Every structure is written in structure tokens, then in C-alpha cells.
Amino acid sequence: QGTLIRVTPEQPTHAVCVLGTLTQLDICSSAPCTSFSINASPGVVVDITWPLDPGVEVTLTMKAASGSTGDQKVQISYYGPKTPPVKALLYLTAVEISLCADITRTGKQRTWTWGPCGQGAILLVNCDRDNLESSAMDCEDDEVLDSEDLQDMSLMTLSTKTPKDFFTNHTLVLHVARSEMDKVRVFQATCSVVLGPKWPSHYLMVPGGKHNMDFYVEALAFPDTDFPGLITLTISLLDTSNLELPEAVVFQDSVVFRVAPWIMTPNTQPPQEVYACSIFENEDFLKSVTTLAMKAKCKLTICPEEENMDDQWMQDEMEIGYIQAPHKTLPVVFDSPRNRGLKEFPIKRVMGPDFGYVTRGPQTGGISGLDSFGNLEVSPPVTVRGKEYPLGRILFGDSCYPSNDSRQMHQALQDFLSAQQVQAPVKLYSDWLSVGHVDEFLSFVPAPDRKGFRLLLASPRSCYKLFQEQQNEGHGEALLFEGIKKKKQQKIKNILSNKTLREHNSFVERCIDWNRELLKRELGLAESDIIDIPQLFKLKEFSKAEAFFPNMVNMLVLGKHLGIPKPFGPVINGRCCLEEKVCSLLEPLGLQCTFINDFFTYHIRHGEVHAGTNVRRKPFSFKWWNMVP
């Protein structure tokens, strides 16, 4: 924002100076004389009698806006040994032109910088539906239909201070690059659109004197492969004094916004609302989660069969995250392209007033089981070899290498999660599982000590240890699947002696162990952060793994209240020894384990308590923009 004014003794120069910019003088170019002096009016400060040498720097600064055009003046008097002083005149008009936004991230350089010492305003994607009896997200049209909609938007203000006749001969234009105009929309308040997808520039109607003009800005797209997340809005001051010449830019200024990313919440963030769509065949399951929700002080919402279309897997069609700006935080549903019976639920029931909506991927096919959000989780806050991840790290399951028979989460999804930047995704190995979800082998639960959590992992090892121990104590005859009328009981001794079952579970152990070490490296975990949950598996179709008995790690974590699938283990001394083992592991952390009968309703259809439910949790207090990804 430098300006070099050429002064000439042939004729007076006229020029505008925007306060806060650098104005310098070319005194030599058109000089007559050896020396020069400068005299200015009191409102102009000259930094710099001197010789007429090109390298002499003369800079002008004005203290305040002009009351009238040319109301400040500079007189450069050129003189020499035998030469009467020759004067050149410069008439100046000072103005204030400041485009302001919440760049300190509280309440209202042109670079956006991350961290607690950084600078740059935040913009939210206007992806919720505050409008009354409507179907569209607020950002899809070009009007503000509700006053509360403005709460989601970012305030930008143009303060000007000029002479009363200034815009007779100057005009301000507000603009956005054509490459960015599809991702933002800006409204002028008195609300109507001035900038947006169809309109990259607008002539502002601005009166002279002191004026303040308010704009509200909404983002229309999340960061993604094609969009780093920055929007720049610019004000240009144009000289329109000459009716026979094009307009001339005399000043530009900008504000850069960053669009807020979609952020997930781990199991360690306090729960606010529990979801089930357990209106289908069975009500006792639904009774148990309802009791847990009540216990954990959560709102409860349930999706009935008429809307379910017999799709009970509430975990899988969606993930409830949030977006956060200094002025506004709101939950936002990421809708999976899974699109099974629950397809309409996120659209029709979850998005709404102060509940946003995002989706990715192809919506009519081209998808896989790894696109179900049982395969989408996040770790608690972690620090990894000095690098801090204060919002945790997204975890999703993959194959170990791409083959003709391997599955992955769709690239569009993977690409969206990475572009949010703030929970740096980690690919885990889940494709050994029939269903294929990371929620089939891991969970996180709060803990009052160490890093504030434990990683729980399914463990065949722990279960064989448990069963061998019982057998060693004379309980070899004890029956797995006691309590189940429509099932073949199996004795501890027969389970242990089964060599194929053992081989299968060794292969599974290896798969989970691979993930263990991977989580250890990528989350900075030590063994002491990890608890193994006794769990047997069996290989079936395509040698893919399924739970031998109810997969206890596929649990609903509602703070210290846990909803754990009931394994129906061998009953020794009046109690299922699996439940007893799990309790011995988790109760010491102050966790309360509730065992829920999901056997014929969920287990038998390839999922458990976690798979049949979902949870909205409290957003992190840590502000994402304060991270340095």
C-alpha cells in the first residue's frame, strides 16, 4: 500500500491519502536548482532544508480525515545559489477507509495465521436450517429469511470518514475473486445480497462524512481438496473524476476469512443426546439405552420403523460433529452416503435450527461398508512426540494394501476429513472384519488418571487366558451361551480344545495387534493407556472376522455409564465370567458397566450396542484456530 506522488512546478498536483498508508514524494523527477525545502499545513507530518538528490526519502503522513477536498497542502520550494525560490504545490484530501472483521477472534497484516498469537477472522458454513417450515439449508438461496439466521454469519464493517462531497468523484467497490465467489455470500445490512456465486463485485452507495456500513458473510462450502478454506473480501476505492477516462484504483484493502472445519467428538467428550432407531422388533434393548440416557442426563431421540424402513444401525448413517466460530458454535451432521433405510433421518430429523448438515460421496451407488460411520471415530486429545492434537485424531478403517478384493472408505470422504486439517486422519486396518468397522475392535472410555482415557481393544488373548483360568479352577464344563434358548451351548473345555477356532483367533489377534502398534505410534500411546477386553472371533465368508459372542467393545459410552453388549458367557459362581472380567477391568476407573441383551436383535445381524446407537457430544472448549496443524 505504498504511493509515490510526483510533484511538479509546472502545475499543482491533487491527490488522496488514505490514513494508515505510506505516502512518499518524488521531488526530483520534474525539478528545475540544487536544494529544496518543504512546508506543509499542520495536519501533514513530513519525515525526511535538503539537497535535490534522488535518494532523499520524503514521506507524508496525515493525522486525520479531511473536512474538505484539498484542505491540506504541501509546498515544495526549489532553490539554488542565484535562483529565486520556485514552488510546487500539492493539495491533499485525507480519508479513512477501513474494512473490519473479527481478526483477533473475539468480537468486532492481511494473512490468515493459526495459533494463539495468530490473526484472521472466522467464517462458518451456513449449513443449518433456521427457516421455519422449509427443506433447504439456509445458505442455498440468496436471502436472509430469518433474523436469527444472522447469528450464524460473520460481521464485517466498512468505516469511512471523508469530506461531504467525496463520493461525487470517487466510488467504493466491494469484491471477491471469481475463483472464490461460489463459496461465500455477503449481505448488506440497513439485508440484501451484494456479493455471491453470481456477483463478484458491487458498487457501494456511500455518503460523504462519517459512515459505517455493516455486512454479514456466510460461507457456502467446507474446506476440501479443491478449497483450502480461505476467503478474501476486498474494498477498492476508485477515482471517477474524469468522465472521459476509465475508473482508476487508488486504494485496496482486504480481510481474509477462514472457513471453520467440521470437527468430530470422541467418546471422552460429555454426551448431550443419544440416538436410537430401536423402534423396530425389540423394546427391551430400547429400554436399557433409555435408562442409560436418563442416567447420563442426555436428551434421547428415537427413529420409528415407519421412517427406519427396518434399518436399525443408527451408528452408521451419520456422525454428529460441530463447527465453531467465536460468535457461534453449532452441531453439524455428516450424513454418510451409506443411504440405507435411515437415509432420510439426518435430512428430515437431525438438521434444523442450529443443527447443520454436510454430506459427501456418490449418493446412488459406488459405495462400500467402510463408508458406514461405525468406521469413523476420533481419539481423545493426544500429544505425539511433542506434536499436540488437542481435538484428537480421526480414525477410520482401511485395507493394508489395495487389491481386487479390498475395500476402502470412498476417496471423497477421506479427502473431506483430511482437508478439515484439525483432526489429522489416521488410517487403521479394519478390512479383515466382515462388516469392516473400526468400532468392532476399539473404543475409548474416560478415565480419571493418566491421559484421561483408556483405549479399549478387543482381545482373543484375554479371553483364552480367562477361559483357561476357569478350566484350571475346575469349570471346564461351564457353558458359553447359557441364557440363550435358541442356541447350542458350548463348554469352556471344547472352546479351548478347538484348534481351528484358535487359529482363526490368532490371525485376528495379529490384525488387532497391528492396529495396536499403529495406534501406539500415531496417537503416542503407551501400554498403560491400553486395556484388552476378552473377545473371541470366528472367520466366515471370505475368511472375514465376525464376533463369536456379543462384541463387548462395540459399546455405548455415556460418560462413566457404559452400555456393553451382554456376552452370555460361562456362569461361574452365579455370574457371567466375561462380565465379571470386564467389570474388574473398568470399575477401577470409576466406570459403571450395564450389560444389554442385544443378542437376537443386533448381534445376530452383525453389530451390537454401539452399532445400534449414536451420540451428540459437547464440543471441545479448545478453539480449533488456536491449533497449529
Binding site: 427396518d310 436399525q312 444401525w313 452408521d316 440405507r340 461398508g369 458406514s372 461405525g374 466382515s434 462388516v435 445381524r605 452383525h606 453389530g607 452399532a611
Partner: peptide
């Protein structure tokens, strides 16, 4: 009706 497909 299974989790799988």
C-alpha cells in the same frame, strides 16, 4: 437387515 451390506 444386517449391518453388513
Amino acid at each position: 437387515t444386517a449391518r453388513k451390506s
